[PDB]
Amino acid sequence: PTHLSVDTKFKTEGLCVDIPGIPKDMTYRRLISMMGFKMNYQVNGYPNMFITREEAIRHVRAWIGFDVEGCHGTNLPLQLGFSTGVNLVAVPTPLMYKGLPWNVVRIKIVQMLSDTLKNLSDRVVFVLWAHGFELTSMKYFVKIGPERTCCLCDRRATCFSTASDTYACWHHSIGFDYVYNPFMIDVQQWGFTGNLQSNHDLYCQVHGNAHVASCDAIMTRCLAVHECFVKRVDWTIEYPIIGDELKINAACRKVQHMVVKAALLADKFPVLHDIGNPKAIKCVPQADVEWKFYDAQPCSDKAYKIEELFYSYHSDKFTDGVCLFWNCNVDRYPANSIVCRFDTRVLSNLNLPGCDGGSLYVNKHAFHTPAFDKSAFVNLKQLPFFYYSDSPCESHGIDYVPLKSATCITRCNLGGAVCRHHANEYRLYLDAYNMMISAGFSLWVYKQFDTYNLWNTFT
Ligand SMILES: COCC(=O)Nc1ccc(O)cc1
Ligand SMILES: [Zn+2]
Ligand SMILES: [Zn+2]
Ligand SMILES: [Zn+2]
16 A cells, blocks of 8 residues: 555545535546546556555655635635745736636746755645635646656656646746645545644644635644654655755754863863763764763654653762753753754755744654744853864875964964964865754753863873
């Protein structure tokens, strides 16, 4: 059972207000036919327009909430809402666009999905809370058929042009008018009691209902994200590389080793409490320190309460030494900490919008992270940039412009002039640091941290 069967039953109760007298007994096959699409028995890689929850989770980057609200059904004009915040009005003659015919509306839809998804995914998945109009309106902007490749590249086709009779991916679809072979999933098929707002509002206060179609489209995708990534967590699903994932993860490993090595040299803590990943290894394996591990998985709902991680009866004394919280999101960190906390507000192709202020960070695996809260770090300060190194000054083996910096903490810089080796290593580390910061990670440290205490290790 790879794909969803077209002979699977579809509960049509949520459709009977827009579609009165709809058969209670309904399959995907009959629904697709009712929507105006002919599948003609096609074993060409597109078995069903509707997909399973497991396939939807594998393609979370393609999710676009979609909702259609009648303003007045081929007689009345429809308001099309997308989780991008766009509202288009179609006439059959929170960005609100005036009533325009379908032939020009469909052009805007391909432009919008292409610009939203070209750097995210090879497809679109319309996430629905289906009442009728969104499915019946799909025939005015969707064309289906066999799986195809782009006319200008090797990616799968996601768009079609009537003007040129050709197919394109999101990167080459300029001027295309049809959405080609889209995917869709109805959240209402998952078994919920009550309307969209009542289910969404149970888990989210950040999205409201200004009573437009895009509001519902946003609430739909947020409810889907809550169900598939907040309450249900599967860390065994891998995701393709769509950006700087390899560089960001290597930058995070270098920064961690650096920052923890220097805190241990500067303040010589006798014990380090490493709270987080149950699979974590010592990031500074040569340190003298008593390294103690505490397991806590990444929290996806709310950030951990420090009282429930530390108390209820390890050294038991977390107040001795330093606490390391590398991506272990808590409500309020203790004052003796080193913290890497992902900032959910960051705008990037890896960070997708989430539930209740949180975000879905997709790098190798999907991690719904709770909302970034500035008050979590009141007992700490922002960790300032510095590069520290005790390694010998020796070139071995790119050209050179002499490096002058107050934050290159090395024997050569103490001695008055940074050597070539430490200058290459400084600029490589600064690049990894800027990568890590721009990916959304924020660094914080105990208030007594001072890089001035690092020069004394050059005696
Ligand atoms: C389908 O998954 C393919 C893959 O290898 N993905 C991957 C993503 C990020 C990363 O940092 C390393 C690997
Ligand atoms: Zn292409
Ligand atoms: Zn929400
Ligand atoms: Zn040097």
